[PDB]
Design an enzyme around this catalytic site. Structure first.
Site, PDB file in Angstrom:
ATOM      1  N   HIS A 132      -8.280   8.859  -2.472  1.00 15.33           N
ATOM      2  CA  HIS A 132      -7.693   8.792  -1.123  1.00 15.33           C
ATOM      3  C   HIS A 132      -8.664   9.291  -0.039  1.00 15.33           C
ATOM      4  O   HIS A 132      -8.776   8.715   1.069  1.00 15.33           O
ATOM      5  CB  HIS A 132      -6.392   9.647  -1.107  1.00 15.33           C
ATOM      6  CG  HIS A 132      -5.435   9.303  -0.020  1.00 15.33           C
ATOM      7  ND1 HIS A 132      -4.069   9.432  -0.181  1.00 15.33           N
ATOM      8  CD2 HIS A 132      -5.625   8.805   1.228  1.00 15.33           C
ATOM      9  CE1 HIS A 132      -3.466   9.096   0.940  1.00 15.33           C
ATOM     10  NE2 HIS A 132      -4.381   8.673   1.805  1.00 15.33           N
TER      11      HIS A 132
ATOM     12  N   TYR B 161       2.385  10.016  -0.012  1.00 14.48           N
ATOM     13  CA  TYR B 161       3.401   9.477   0.887  1.00 14.48           C
ATOM     14  C   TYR B 161       4.794   9.860   0.411  1.00 14.48           C
ATOM     15  O   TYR B 161       5.749   9.605   1.144  1.00 14.48           O
ATOM     16  CB  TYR B 161       3.322   7.930   0.942  1.00 14.48           C
ATOM     17  CG  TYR B 161       2.019   7.413   1.472  1.00 14.48           C
ATOM     18  CD1 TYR B 161       1.673   6.055   1.357  1.00 14.48           C
ATOM     19  CD2 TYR B 161       1.096   8.268   2.079  1.00 14.48           C
ATOM     20  CE1 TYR B 161       0.472   5.605   1.874  1.00 14.48           C
ATOM     21  CE2 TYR B 161      -0.125   7.802   2.595  1.00 14.48           C
ATOM     22  CZ  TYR B 161      -0.402   6.465   2.490  1.00 14.48           C
ATOM     23  OH  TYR B 161      -1.604   6.011   2.953  1.00 14.48           O
TER      24      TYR B 161
ATOM     25  N   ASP C 220       0.800  -1.237   0.000  1.00 12.61           N
ATOM     26  CA  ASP C 220       0.000   0.000   0.000  1.00 12.61           C
ATOM     27  C   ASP C 220       0.835   1.292   0.000  1.00 12.61           C
ATOM     28  O   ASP C 220       1.511   1.621   0.987  1.00 12.61           O
ATOM     29  CB  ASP C 220      -0.917   0.009   1.240  1.00 12.61           C
ATOM     30  CG  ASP C 220      -1.944   1.151   1.196  1.00 12.61           C
ATOM     31  OD1 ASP C 220      -2.963   1.032   0.505  1.00 12.61           O
ATOM     32  OD2 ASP C 220      -1.754   2.178   1.896  1.00 12.61           O
TER      33      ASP C 220
ATOM     34  N   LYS D 283      -2.873   5.778  -4.671  1.00  8.67           N
ATOM     35  CA  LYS D 283      -4.109   6.551  -4.415  1.00  8.67           C
ATOM     36  C   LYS D 283      -4.038   7.972  -4.972  1.00  8.67           C
ATOM     37  O   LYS D 283      -2.952   8.618  -4.972  1.00  8.67           O
ATOM     38  CB  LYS D 283      -4.436   6.634  -2.912  1.00  8.67           C
ATOM     39  CG  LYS D 283      -4.183   5.380  -2.028  1.00  8.67           C
ATOM     40  CD  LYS D 283      -4.463   5.730  -0.548  1.00  8.67           C
ATOM     41  CE  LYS D 283      -4.160   4.560   0.403  1.00  8.67           C
ATOM     42  NZ  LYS D 283      -2.702   4.285   0.638  1.00  8.67           N
TER      43      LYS D 283
END
Ligand SMILES: NC(=O)c1ccc[n+]([C@@H]2O[C@H](COP(=O)([O-])OP(=O)(O)OC[C@H]3O[C@@H](n4cnc5c(N)ncnc54)[C@H](OP(=O)(O)O)[C@@H]3O)[C@@H](O)[C@H]2O)c1
Ligand SMILES: Cc1ccc2[nH]c(C(=O)N3CC=CCC3)cc2c1
Length: 298
Positions: free
Chosen positions: A112, A50, A45, A79
């Site tokens: 997201h 990120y 994931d 995402k």
């Protein structure tokens, strides 16, 4: 060890969470992702947010290239960040994550969050103060459907949606694809059992993040109870001779929830895959259910 998704694809039921706070140097995500794949994790994931898709993709490509795994045996999720909810931006945002990771497709692409933000990561106005945008989530979803039509995303889903927000999509006229999943905060202190029953009823898999009680980043109240010191989880840990983390993950597997687990620690990464080695009794399951208290970490 997978669940079949409502579009006929398979998701492995244990996945590796890749987010680390910005104090952690980027290269670390390369190293820990390799270790994750070495220990047996196949579902990984990540997200535009990120800032690690380059390193995560390298770890994946490194293990493909040396024969440790086939691309078809990895389930990679990314995402759509909230500044890209406008439909004409959705496919380019996916294509950018693909360029960074140097992957040809993602197994799963998610919205997201239901929130929309000014196109441009966190646009802030003259006093603070996040700049929201009004974008019908259903029109974002339609641009998501095209990414699946194009083979850029094998599966598409959502994240941080409540039941009404799911129904905005499920009730959409002309609906081509259901979301496969709704990835949400879900652990013994905030177990989502109501949302779970809803998702099961629509053949939507619930994917639990912060399943181990979150990383408690101080940007998360430091007064909140600490999930892994919960006396029930620790009594279950000793009874089964595993750990509180593993009891928390196994609880999710036996409820039909797909569960993520972040670790940047070599022993903990290897440990987390023990989740397949033991089971919880119905009475164990019931003790864990008793912990629900509507505590939100994130
Ligand atoms: N969709 C969303 O909005 C959303 C939101 C939050 C998270 N996520 C995703 O979900 C993933 C996981 O959630 P999370 O980051 O909140 O963390 P989490 O999986 O709840 O992990 C919390 C902490 O547990 C520790 N840990 C792991 N295994 C352990 C074990 N066997 N014994 C003891 N401690 C253990 C880890 O620290 P060490 O690193 O030191 O082992 C980790 O910081 C994220 O990395 C991200 O991929 C998505
Ligand atoms: C407004 C909004 C909505 C959903 C969100 N999700 C994340 C996220 O995915 N994080 C932050 C915390 C732990 C690990 C990764 C950040 C964020 C921000």
């Amino acid at each position: 060890q997978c669940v079949k998704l409502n579009d006929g694809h398979f998701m492995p039921v244990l996945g590796f969470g890749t987010y680390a706070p910005p104090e952690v140097p980027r290269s670390k995500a390369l190293e820990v992702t390799k270790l994750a794949i070495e220990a047996g994790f196949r579902h990984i994931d990540s997200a535009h947010l990120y800032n690690n898709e380059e390193q995560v993709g390298l770890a994946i490509r490194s293990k493909i290239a040396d024969g440790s795994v086939k691309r078809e045996d990895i389930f990679y999720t990314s995402k759509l960040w909230s500044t890209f909810h406008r439909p004409e931006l959705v496919r380019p945002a996916l294509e950018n994550s693909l360029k960074k990771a140097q992957l040809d497709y993602v197994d799963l692409y998610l919205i997201h969050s239901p929130m929309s933000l000014k196109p441009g990561l966190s646009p802030t106005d003259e006093n603070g103060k996040v700049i929201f945008d009004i974008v019908d989530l259903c029109t974002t979803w339609e641009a998501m459907e095209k990414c699946k039509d194009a083979g850029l995303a094998k599966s598409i889903g959502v994240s941080n949606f409540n039941r009404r927000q799911l129904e905005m999509i499920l009730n959409k006229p002309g609906l081509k694809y259901k979301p496969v999943c709704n990835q949400v905060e879900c652990h013994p202190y905030f177990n989502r059992s109501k949302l779970l029953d809803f998702c099961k009823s629509k053949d939507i898999v619930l994917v639990a993040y912060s399943a181990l009680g979150s990383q408690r980043d101080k940007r998360v109240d430091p007064n909140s109870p600490v999930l892994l010191e919960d006396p029930v989880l620790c009594a279950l840990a000793k009874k089964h001779k595993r750990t509180p983390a593993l009891i928390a993950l196994r609880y999710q597997l036996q409820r039909g929830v797909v569960v993520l687990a972040k670790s940047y620690n070599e022993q903990r990464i290897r440990q987390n895959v023990q989740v397949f080695e033991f089971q919880l009794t119905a009475e164990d399951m019931k003790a864990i259910d008793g912990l629900d208290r509507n505590l939100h970490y994130f």
